Structures are given as C-alpha cells and as structure tokens.
C-alpha cells in the first residue's frame, strides 16, 4: 500500500512554478530575438532591398552600381567601408546565432520550468528528488530507481 | 510547443538569410555608388545611421553567445534526474547501512 509516489512533487516544483514567473524566459527570448530584431533593424531602410536581392534583385542591382553609379559620378566613399563589414559580421554572427539559437532558444524558455526545481536542474542537488523524496518517486523509474 | 514556434521563426529567418552569408558584400560599394552618381552627376544615410545599430546588434549578439555559457542550464534537469543514479543509490546505500544493524 505504499502507493503514493512523490514524482508529482518532483513535478509540483515543475508543473506551474514556470508560469508564476512566465515572463523571465520572454526577457531572454527577447535577447535571443534581439539578434533577429537587430538584424531586422539593420535590414529596414537601405537593406530593405536585401529582402528582394535574395530573390529578384540578385542579378540586377549589384552590378549596375559598379559602372552606372560611378560613370554618372566621375563625398561618397567614407561610411560604406565601415558599416557593411559590420553588417557582414552581423550575418556571420547571425548564422552562428541561429546555430546557437537552435540549441539555446529552447534552453531559456525551458529553464523557467526548473526554476523552483533548480536543485533537480543542478547536478549536486537533484539527488533529493531522485533519492531522498524518492523511495516511492522512483517507482515509475523502477529500473533506474533501485 | 512554444519552443518549436520560436525555432520555426528562427529556422525560417535562418533559411531566408541563407544567401546573405555570401551575398551581403553587394552593399559594400553599392551603398557608396548609389550616392556617387547622383551627387557627382553635374545614400550615406543608411551607411552612417546603421553603424550605431551594429553596436546594439553586437550587444544583442553578445547575449546570444553569452547564453551559450548557460547552454547546459535547462536540459540538465531531465538529464540529471536519471544519470545520477550512482549517487542516488549511494545516499540510500547508507540507508541500507542502517538496516544491516548486525
């Protein structure tokens, strides 16, 4: 009649303590989306063409400027060599953000679930909910919980 | 459920910026050129103004990579609850130490 299993308790820390501060993760998701937003910020007015350079302006607008916009010309050199490489750095930092976000965006949102069971999160303190309050909690994990 | 939705937007924005990784040099001189012809016939606003955003973009990128230090903070909760059975039985092994009182 030891039919109590405290796995509910291990999940009682987990079930809805995430929602008690549901907006901690959204602040971090804003930070993760910030690189998406800041990339969107830098792709707003002049790089608005980049949204269609990827599809339509690919073979048209890149090469016409190199001749027509200088044949018409010959106060137009200073800022282009400083910001675009930073924009290229942003693209370099975006693909690596996406690789990170493919393995980090789940982390911040999920980690609010172990907020209260941060002991269950951290290695040196998950034992209490896996050993101490577990002489019935380990029943579902009977093979694991000897 | 919401973990995949944000990643879907991430993956979509990752896959529609696929070419920009090697097609972002198009603005290196077009930004300069598409002002040059008009002013000198007889665009700098995007170039100058955006330089401010990159510093904010870098700081936003800094938090993206700074969280990689915390990449092992969330998934461990399900992982630690299982893989630590060596110490789990150890703490209940001293329990077994009590029972064999002889």
Swiss-Prot record, chain A:
Subcellular location: Cytoplasm, Cytoskeleton, Spindle; Cytoplasm, Cytoskeleton, Phragmoplast
Gene null: resulting phenotype: Lethal when homozygous.
Top-level division of the source organism's lineage: Eukaryota
Functional summary from the UniProt entry: Involved in microtubules reorganization during spindle and phragmoplast development.
Family per similarity comment: Belongs to the HAUS5 family.
Quaternary structure annotation from Swiss-Prot or TrEMBL: Part of the augmin complex composed of 8 subunits. The complex acts on microtubules and interacts with gamma-tubulin in spindles and the phragmoplast.
Identification of the protein by name: AUGMIN subunit 5
Classification of source organism: Eukaryota, Viridiplantae, Streptophyta, Embryophyta, Tracheophyta
Gene expressing this chain: AUG5
UniProtKB/Swiss-Prot annotation, chain B:
Oligomer status and interactors: Part of the augmin complex composed of 8 subunits. The complex acts on microtubules and interacts with gamma-tubulin in spindles and the phragmoplast. Interacts with AUG1.
Effect of inactivating the gene: Lethal when homozygous.
Protein name in the entry: AUGMIN subunit 3
Cellular compartments annotated: Cytoplasm, Cytoskeleton, Spindle; Cytoplasm, Cytoskeleton, Phragmoplast
Superkingdom field: Eukaryota
Primary role: Involved in microtubules reorganization during spindle and phragmoplast development. Required for gamma-tubulin localization during mitosis.
Family membership noted in the UniProt record: Belongs to the HAUS3 family.
């Amino acid at each position: 009649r030891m039919l109590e299993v405290s796995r509910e308790e291990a999940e009682r820390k987990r079930m809805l303590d995430e929602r008690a501060n549901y907006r901690h993760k959204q602040a971090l998701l804003e930070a993760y989306d910030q690189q998406c937003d800041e990339a969107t910020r830098i792709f707003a007015e002049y790089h608005k063409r980049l949204q269609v350079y990827v599809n339509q302006a690919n073979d048209a607008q890149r090469s016409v400027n190199s001749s027509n916009e200088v044949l018409s010309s010959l106060a137009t050199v200073i800022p282009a060599s400083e910001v675009v490489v930073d924009i290229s750095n942003s693209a370099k930092d975006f693909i690596e953000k996406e690789v990170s976000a493919f393995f980090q965006s789940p982390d911040n949102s999920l980690y609010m679930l172990p907020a209260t069971p941060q002991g269950l999160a951290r290695d040196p303190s998950a034992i209490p909910s896996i050993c101490r309050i577990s002489a019935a909690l380990q029943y579902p994990a009977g093979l694991e919980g000897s | 459920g919401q973990i995949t939705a944000i990643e879907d937007s991430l993956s979509a924005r990752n896959l529609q910026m696929n070419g920009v990784l090697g097609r972002l040099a198009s603005t290196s001189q077009e930004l300069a050129h598409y002002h040059s012809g008009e002013e000198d016939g007889i665009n700098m606003l995007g170039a100058f103004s955006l330089l401010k955003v990159i510093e904010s973009e870098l700081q936003g990128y800094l938090s993206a990579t700074r969280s990689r230090v915390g990449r092992c903070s969330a998934l461990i909760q399900a992982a630690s609850d299982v893989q630590e059975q060596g110490a789990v039985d150890d703490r209940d092994s001293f329990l077994h130490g009590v029972r064999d009182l002889l």
